[PDB]
Amino acid sequence: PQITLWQRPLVTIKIGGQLKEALLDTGADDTVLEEMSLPGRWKPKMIGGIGGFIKVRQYDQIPIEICGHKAIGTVLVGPTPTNVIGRNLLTQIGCTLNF
Amino acid sequence: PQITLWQRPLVTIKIGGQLKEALLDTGADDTVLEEMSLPGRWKPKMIGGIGGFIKVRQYDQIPIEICGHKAIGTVLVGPTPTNVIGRNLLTQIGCTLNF
Numbered sequence: 001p002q003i004t005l006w007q008r009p010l011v012t013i014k015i016g017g018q019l020k021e022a023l024l025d026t027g028a029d030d031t032v033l034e035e036m037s038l039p040g041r042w043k044p045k046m047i048g049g050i051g052g053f054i055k056v057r058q059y060d061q062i063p064i065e066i067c068g069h070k071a072i073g074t075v076l077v078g079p080t081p082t083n084v085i086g087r088n089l090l091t092q093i094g095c096t097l098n099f
Numbered sequence: 100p101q102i103t104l105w106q107r108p109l110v111t112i113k114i115g116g117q118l119k120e121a122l123l124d125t126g127a128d129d130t131v132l133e134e135m136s137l138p139g140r141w142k143p144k145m146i147g148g149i150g151g152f153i154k155v156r157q158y159d160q161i162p163i164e165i166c167g168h169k170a171i172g173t174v175l176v177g178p179t180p181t182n183v184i185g186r187n188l189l190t191q192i193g194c195t196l197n198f
């Protein structure tokens with residue numbers, strides 16, 4: 001699809017058996033989601049944005065589906081004010097900026 | 100151009116006659132630059148990010164070139180970790196997401 005930027009580019013993702021809304025976010029290196037359970041190993045991480053850093057749990061090799069597109073990658077979970085899909089997963093669905 | 104997302108989508112912008120690097124950021128409503136001088140009066144704005152809010156100065160109707168594409172609009176100036184070009188200006192240069 002071609003996604004306009006007149007409005008926030010929100011999509012539905014399927015992850016960990018759950019459906020969530022998230023922002024397609026080219027300024028995010030990493031995908032960051034609000035508190036939720038995910039299976040498998042994790043390690044703590046600090047990530048930084050406008051306003052400073054938050055502590056998150058880093059889960060690797062997590063399957064996700066975005067707009068019918070399956071991908072696998074790292075998902076950071078913690079107290080983000082908004083769910084964002086970062087470049088680590090945007091690449092996998094073949095998402096580009098165009099102008 | 101078509102810009103893939105395997106690296107940060109960093110482009111050169113020109114503002115007040117000077118070149119800077121900035122991140123094309125579909126997850127940003129607004130454009131926020133590191134401390135700099137701009138002309139005219141400014142209004143207050145609080146903008147919210149992963150780590151909370153920061154206070155910025157809002158300047159309106161500022162000319163800015165983004166990858167050689169001419170835009171004139173609102174620029175916020177304050178203690179951001181990185182220069183970000185948000186949707187207010189990405190729409191002026193005809194940017195979309197595509198996959």
Ligand SMILES: CNc1nc2ccc(S(=O)(=O)N(CC(C)C)C[C@@H](O)[C@H](Cc3ccccc3)NC(=O)O[C@H]3CO[C@H]4OC[C@H](Cl)[C@H]43)cc2o1
Nearest residue numbers: 027028029030048049050126127128129146147148149180
């Ligand atoms: C109301 N108007 C307004 N304009 C905004 C502009 C930017 C921002 S923002 O807080 O920087 N942010 C909003 C998102 C997180 C919902 C834009 C987002 O792309 C920010 C842009 C950014 C880039 C580097 C450092 C700091 C910030 N991305 C971000 O926080 O990414 C996190 C998660 O992945 C990493 O990649 C960069 C930073 Cl270090 C980490 C908010 C704004 O609000």
Ligand SMILES: [Cl-]
Nearest residue numbers: 072073074088
């Ligand atoms: Cl990854």
Ligand SMILES: [Cl-]
Nearest residue numbers: 091094103104
């Ligand atoms: Cl590619």
Ligand SMILES: [Cl-]
Nearest residue numbers: 172173187188
């Ligand atoms: Cl504007």
